[PDB]
Amino acid sequence: RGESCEADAIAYQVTASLKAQVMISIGELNQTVDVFVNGDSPARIQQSKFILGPISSAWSPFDKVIVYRDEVYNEDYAPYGSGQAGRFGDIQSRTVNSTDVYANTNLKLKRPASGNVVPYTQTPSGFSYWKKEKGVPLNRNAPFGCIIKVNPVRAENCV
Amino acid sequence: SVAHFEAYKATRPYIGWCADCGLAGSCPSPVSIEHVWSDADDGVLKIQVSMQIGIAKSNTINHAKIRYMGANGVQEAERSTLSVSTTAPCDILATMGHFILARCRPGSQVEVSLSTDPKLLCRTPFSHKPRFIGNEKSPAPTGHKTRIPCKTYSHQTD
Amino acid sequence: GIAKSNTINHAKIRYMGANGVQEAERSTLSVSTTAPCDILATMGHFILARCRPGSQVEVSLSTDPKLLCRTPFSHKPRFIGNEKSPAPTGHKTRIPCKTYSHQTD
Amino acid sequence: SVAHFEAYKATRPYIGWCADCGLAGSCPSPVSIEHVWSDADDGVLKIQVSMQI
Amino acid sequence: KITLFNCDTAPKCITYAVDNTVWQYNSQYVPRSEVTEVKGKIHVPFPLTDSTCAVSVAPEPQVTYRLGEVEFHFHPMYPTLFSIRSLGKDPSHSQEWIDTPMSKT
Amino acid sequence: AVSVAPEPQVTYRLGEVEFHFHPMYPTLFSIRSLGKDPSHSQEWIDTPMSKT
After folding, report:
1. E55, D19: Cβ pair inside 8 Å?
2. Distance (Å) of CA B96 to CA A112, B2, B85, B92, E44
3. Is C80 in Cβ contact with F2 (below 8 Å)?
4. Residue partners of A98: CB distance under 8 A and separation at least 6
5. CA–CA distance from C12 to each of A12, C8, C43, C48, C104 (Å)?
6. HSE, side-chain direction, 13 A CA sphere, residue B125
7. Rounded distance, CA B103 to CA E14, Å?
8. Which residues make Cβ contacts (< 8 Å) with residue B116, sequence separation at least 6?
9. List the disulfide bonds (chain C).
10. Distance from C-alpha of C27 to C-alpha of C65, rounded to nearest angstrom
C-alpha cells in the first residue's frame, strides 16, 4: 500500500440520525443549543421547559456514498470484489491499517533469455487513471439545502 | 533504522542493469530507476535510484559529495551536475541518498542523468500526466488569492 | 569529433572560417529541435545524434562562432513498432527497426 | 546615452512577492517576474524582472 | 592464481565479479541474482503530508439581475474550471472549462 | 528490445468472447476476421473499454 492510504478514501453506508441546532428567543435573551430531536427529549433553558418532539419526513442525501478528501461523491460499489485495473478502487482493504487485501492485479514476469537483465509485460495501476474521471458530487445532491462537510461527515442546513 | 545518517553509511551504492548508456548501447550502468512513487497533487515525483547522492565514501553525510558505484567500483564525484528530465529539465527539489525529489513536467518516460564524473544515464518508462494544484491542471500561480490544501512529499529526512 | 592534428578526440570540433582553422569544444555544442539531444557518434562532416521531434533543426556552437544555422526540417513522432512509448530497459519481443550503427567505416 | 548607466543604478532592485517558491506558498523571491509581454511573431519575449543584469 | 587440470571450455569456469557489505532495494530489473544471509532494514523518508499552497485564479462571474432572473458573465484570464450545479433545485452536474467569456442565464 | 503490452483481460460468455482493455500507453489494436468475410479496423487504446 502506498502513502495515499493515510488520507482518502473511506466507504460508508450511512443512515443519519437527526440533531437540530435551534435558537430560542424568549424576547429577553438569544441563545442556541444542540439537542437531538428524535425521541422525547426534555431540556430546560432559562427555566422554561422545552420538550423536542420527534422529527420525521426528513430528507437523506446519503445512501451508498464514498467520501474522498477531495469532495464527497455519491457512488455505488460492491465491497471486497474489485481488483485488476479496469475499475477505480482496485484494492479492497478491511481496515485503515490492514494486512489483507483483495485485489486481482496481474503483472506478468517471464524468464530472461536475452543479454539484458527480465522480460516484463506490466499492466500498471487503474487507480491513478480513474482518479481524474471521479464520480458525480454528493454536494449537489439535495432538492433543498445540504452542504456536505467531509471531515466530521455531516450535512449542514437541510430544510 | 534509528538514525538517518547511519542508515545511508550502511547502504552503499550498487550497480544495476540499464539499457541506456548515453542511448548508445546496453551495459550495466551505475544509475537505474528502482521504483517511482507519485500521488502528490503538486506534481512531485519521488524517485528511488541505485546511486547514493549527498553521501560520501568516507561514511559521513556531505552535501558536496556523491558516491557512485558501477563498473569502476565505488568512486566519488562532486555535485556540480545532477539533472532530472522527462525529456527536458525538471527542478530538483531536494536530494539525499537514493531518494530524489523533483518537480517535473509531463512525459511518457523519466530519465536521471549526470555529466560530472559518472557520465551516463538511465531512462525507464513512467507516466507523468496532470494532477497539478487546485482545479486547473495549469501549474504556475499568478499571485495569492485563496490558500488551498494539497499533498506533497517533504524535503526533510525521517 | 576530429582533431586537426589527425588524432581523434571527442572533446574537439574542427572549423575553419574567418580566423582560419581553429579548434572548438564539443561540450558547448548544442542541437535543438525544440529540446536537447544526446550525441550518438561523430565522424567527419557527419554527426549522429538522437533527438526528439521538431519542425526545425538548429545547430549551434558558441566556443568561437556564437551563431547558428537553422533549416526547416520536419521530424515528427516515428517511434518503433505499432505501440508508442519505447521502453529499452525491458524486453518482451524483439522487432525489426532501422538505425544508423556506430561502426567506423 | 551617457546617463543610461546612472538611471539604472538609481532605480535599484528590490525583493518582492512571487507566488511560486518551489511551490510551498508565496514568498519574497530575489527574482520576481513583474510581467512578461510577447507580441513578436518570431517567438521573442521581452521579460521584465526586479534584478538588473 | 590457481591452475586447475583436466579442462575444457565454457560451463567449467563461470567467472563473475561480486561485492560485499552493500544492499539493494526492490527493482523491476537489475542484477540481484546473489542471495546471502546478511540483511538489514532502512527507513523510508519523504512522507506524503498536507501543506497549503498559495494560488490565485481569475475573477468570479459578474452578476446582473432582472425580475426573477440571474444572469452571469463568465470572465477568465487563462483556462479556469467551472461547474454548474444546483441544490436548491433538482440535481444536476456539469464541468466545463471557460477559456473565453460566455453568458449563461 | 522493447516491452509490447500483454493480452487483455478476457471474459467468456456463451460462444462469444469479451476483452476488457485497460488504460495503458497508446497501442494499436486491430480487429479483424479471416475465417468469415474480411473486415479490418484499426484503433488506439489509451482509454478503458470493453469490446465484444
Report:
1. yes
2. 33, 17, 18, 11, 12
3. yes
4. none
5. 68, 8, 12, 15, 18
6. 20
7. 44
8. B66, B77, B78, B79, B80, B81, B82
9. 37-51
10. 14
